[PDB]
Design a protein around this ligand. Sequence first.
Ligand SMILES: N#Cc1ccc(N(Cc2ccc(OS(N)(=O)=O)cc2)n2cnnc2)cc1
Ligand SMILES: [Zn+2]
Ligand SMILES: [Zn+2]
Length: 258
Amino acid sequence: HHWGYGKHNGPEHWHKDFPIAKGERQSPVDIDTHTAKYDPSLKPLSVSYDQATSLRILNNGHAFNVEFDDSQDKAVLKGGPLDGTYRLIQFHFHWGSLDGQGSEHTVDKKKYAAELHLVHWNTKYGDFGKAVQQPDGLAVLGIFLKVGSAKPGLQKVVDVLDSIKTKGKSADFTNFDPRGLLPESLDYWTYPGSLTTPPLLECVTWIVLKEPISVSSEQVLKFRKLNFNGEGEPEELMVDNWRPAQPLKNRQIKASFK
Ligand SMILES: N#Cc1ccc(N(Cc2ccc(OS(N)(=O)=O)cc2)n2cnnc2)cc1
Ligand SMILES: [Zn+2]
Ligand SMILES: [Zn+2]
């Protein structure tokens, strides 16, 4: 009974295998703009992706991930609420069965069509495996996707999905520049959280951008043609792979903007 996003192995059942699911700093959360607090101490985000080296794209049964070479201090994230440098290791999306839902975080209860997660790990811990065991081991940059004009930089990603439809499938995906997935502005909200899928470790400093990126309905539609299952098996479309908003508890969401 491996976890999943189904009615019988989904988010509501996760706590049985991973007790931390009911922890003090679980993600995602709803960002209440009536209560978010502007912190003038927050520094601007520093994103250096010019040396980004993508390797491949894979369907792991939970979503599709684009993996990067994090061997050298190439693509790193710093500044903002972070101390030290964080290396980019991979990115993936979460989306819905319809345009009206799909994002994990919400803003004043508003859901977006999808959410992009760029995962980075703190270099002071040596590797990703050790970083996940620390409260400040990871930094995930969350970007909302709204349906509108097409996003040029996302087309390369969308076109290759046809060849990785089933779980276990992957393809070489070199020379992809993640800079084409970023919005114009880097204003953001931040709070201490967790991974949104099991093991649900509370090792993440969440950085959610205020400005969403626009993608065409044609682009997001291709996300919905992927499958959770492996080739030669009962077909089960990959849709609604998002976790519902969790209790904020005693946490405060800070804003880098007024
Ligand atoms: N300990 C541990 C551990 C850490 C990450 C794992 N991941 C990738 C992943 C990254 C971020 C994430 O969090 S999120 N969604 O970005 O909030 C969810 C999953 N994985 C899944 N299948 N293959 C790899 C698996 C085990
Ligand atoms: Zn108000
Ligand atoms: Zn994610």
